[PDB]
Amino acid sequence: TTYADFIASGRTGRRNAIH
Amino acid sequence: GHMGNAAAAKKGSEQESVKEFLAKAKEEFLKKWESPSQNTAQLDHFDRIKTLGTGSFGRVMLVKHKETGNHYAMKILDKQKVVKLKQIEHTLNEKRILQAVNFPFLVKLEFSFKDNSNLYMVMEYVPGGEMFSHLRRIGRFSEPHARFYAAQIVLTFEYLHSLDLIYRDLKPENLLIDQQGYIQVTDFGFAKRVKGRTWTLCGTPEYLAPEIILSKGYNKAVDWWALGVLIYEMAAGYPPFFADQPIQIYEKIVSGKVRFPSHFSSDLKDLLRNLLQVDLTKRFGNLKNGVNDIKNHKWFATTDWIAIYQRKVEAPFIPKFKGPGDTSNFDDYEEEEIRVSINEKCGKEFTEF
Ligand SMILES: N[C@@H]1CCN(Cc2cccc(-c3ccc4c(O)nccc4c3)c2)C1
Ligand SMILES: [Cl-]
C-alpha cells in the first residue's frame, strides 16, 4: 500500500532542510 | 453564473476589504522594517527550564522571566557556529523579519539581545507542540480538521506575500499549535524579501517546488506549491512525493503525476491538482485572480475567512495543557550548559542584531 511504501522510505521522522 | 447578486456583492466587498487591510499592513511593516527593535532584555532576566528543540546553530529552551513569572521560548544561537555554517545573513534577516511582521498566526518576538558568545531571540511559548507530532500520532487529519489549519496558512501567506516575503520552509515540523488550537508559524530562516524572482536552492525535499529542483528563477508560487504538499500530507498522513533518497523524490515532484488516497474528496483532489501544478502558468496562487482562486475554491466553501482571522472558530483539536510551563507536547533532549565567554566573538558580523 502507499502507507507501507511511506514506512519503507525511512522518511517518517522530522525532516531537515537542505541547509 | 455561480453566484446570485447578494453573494457576488458580498464576495466582491470582502475581496476589496482584504486589499484595504493589506495596504495598511504593508505600511506598518515597512515602518518597522526600516527601524528594527534591538536589545530589549538580558540573559539573567530568565531562568532556563528545558530544551524544547535543537538545530545546527543552537537550541530552543523554555525559559521563565524572573520578574513576571511568564514563560517564553528562547532561541539560543552560537555566533561562532553561525559564522562557520555561513548563516550570518539568514540569522540577521530572520530577526529583522520577526520584529517587523504582525499577524495572528506568526509567532511573536518578545525580546532579543546578545552577549559575548550567543544571540538570543525570546519568542512567545507555543505550548501545544509541533503539528508534526500530532499528525504522526493521530495518523491523518479529517478534511475539516486539515481545512482549519490550511485556512490559517492561506491567510498567513496572503499577508506575507503582500509584503513581498516568500516563506520557503512550510512543513508540519515548522507549525506549532497554540493553547486555543490555532497555528503559529515558526522559523523565518529561509524567508526572503522577493518582489520578483530569486534563485537559491533551499527548503525541505518533500516540499520543494519543481522550479526550485530544476534550478530556475522562482517566485512566491513556490509557497502555494508547498501549501498543496502540506494539505495533502495533513489529509493523507504522508506527503505526495516520497522515496528513500531525495533524488528519487525530486524525480516524482517534477513528473507532473500525483496520486491520491481513495478517501480524498473530489473537491480536495481538484484543489490539490491546481496547487501541485508543475506548469507555473496554471498554478493556483500564481494566476491573474491571485489568492482568490484558492480562497474561492469549493474545498473552502465552508470557510469563514474573517472568523478564522479573528480566532472565533472553534478549533478541532485543543492540545493537552496542564499549566503555564507545561512542556509535555515537546520531546526530551539532552541538556547542555550555556557558556558565555570573554570572547566578544564575531562582534562586527552581528552589529545589527
Ligand atoms: N526549521 C527547523 C524545524 C525545527 N526547528 C528547531 C526546533 C525544533 C523543535 C522545536 C522548536 C521550537 C519549540 C518551541 C517554540 C516556541 O514555543 N516558540 C517559538 C519557537 C519554538 C520552536 C524548534 C528548526
Ligand atoms: Cl530575471
Side-chain angles (χ1 to χ4, degrees), chain B residues 51-56 58-63 65-80 82-83 87-115 118-194 196-215 217-246 248-256 258 260-287 289-309:
Chain B
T51 294
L52 302 175
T54 64
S56 300
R59 58 178 67 227
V60 180
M61 301 199 70
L62 179 67
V63 303
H65 190 259
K66 292 176 189 177
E67 282 280 297
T68 68
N70 295 326
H71 288 87
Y72 296 97
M74 171 187 290
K75 183 186 271 191
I76 308 165
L77 300 87
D78 182 303
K79 281 185 273 171
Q80 294 169 336
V82 170
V83 172
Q87 294 297 284
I88 298 161
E89 298 287 343
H90 301 275
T91 300
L92 293 174
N93 178 64
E94 167 168 65
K95 188 267 226 177
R96 193 188 172 196
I97 292 172
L98 275 173
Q99 62 84 36
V101 296
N102 178 36
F103 204 66
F105 316 124
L106 296 177
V107 72
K108 287 163 175 52
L109 180 70
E110 303 278 53
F111 310 99
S112 60
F113 55 93
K114 59 194 166 178
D115 68 18
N118 304 309
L119 314 174
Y120 303 89
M121 287 191 279
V122 182
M123 292 170 281
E124 317 176 74
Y125 177 44
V126 187
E130 312 145 79
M131 182 192 288
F132 180 90
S133 303
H134 295 289
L135 181 57
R136 291 289 179 274
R137 181 179 50 81
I138 297 164
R140 67 171 170 92
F141 300 154
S142 73
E143 295 189 27
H145 183 173
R147 179 159 49 240
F148 172 80
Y149 296 148
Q152 296 168 63
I153 301 302
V154 171
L155 289 176
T156 300
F157 284 176
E158 183 167 44
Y159 172 80
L160 290 173
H161 291 175
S162 81
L163 306 180
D164 303 315
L165 290 167
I166 311 178
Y167 181 65
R168 302 200 293 191
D169 204 19
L170 187 67
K171 51 183 175 185
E173 291 91 320
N174 282 343
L175 303 177
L176 305 183
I177 309 304
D178 72 25
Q179 182 180 356
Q180 293 82 37
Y182 283 74
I183 300 294
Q184 292 275 108
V185 176
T186 67
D187 204 336
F188 286 81
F190 296 123
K192 188 178 180 184
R193 199 126 193 259
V194 183
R197 313 164 83 186
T198 199
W199 289 261
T200 308
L201 170 62
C202 63
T204 299
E206 284 81 345
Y207 282 75
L208 295 184
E211 59 268 29
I212 305 179
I213 290 162
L214 294 172
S215 303
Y218 63 84
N219 76 350
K220 62 189 186 47
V222 303
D223 282 336
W224 297 122
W225 173 279
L227 174 66
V229 180
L230 182 75
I231 297 173
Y232 185 116
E233 182 171 351
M234 289 190 297
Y238 48 79
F241 315 107
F242 60 75
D244 290 9
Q245 296 299 328
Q248 297 163 305
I249 303 181
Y250 302 154
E251 293 177 343
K252 294 176 186 193
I253 290 167
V254 304
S255 73
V258 56
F260 300 107
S262 67
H263 62 81
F264 275 23
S265 68
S266 285
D267 291 341
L268 178 54
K269 292 183 289 186
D270 186 271
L271 176 61
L272 295 175
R273 287 180 167 122
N274 283 290
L275 292 170
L276 301 174
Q277 171 54 260
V278 170
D279 182 348
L280 277 166
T281 74
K282 299 185 176 192
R283 188 181 304 151
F284 274 18
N286 204 42
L287 312 179
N289 202 29
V291 189
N292 296 320
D293 286 322
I294 301 168
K295 292 171 79 181
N296 298 342
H297 190 278
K298 281 197 197 290
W299 194 69
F300 285 117
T302 66
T303 300
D304 181 342
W305 295 100
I306 297 295
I308 293 284
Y309 171 77

Side-chain angles (χ1 to χ4, degrees), chain B residues 25-26 29-30 33-36 38-41:
Chain B
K26 188 171 190 92
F29 165 82
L30 289 174
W33 189 237
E34 287 301 313
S35 300
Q38 290 182 96
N39 193 37
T40 50

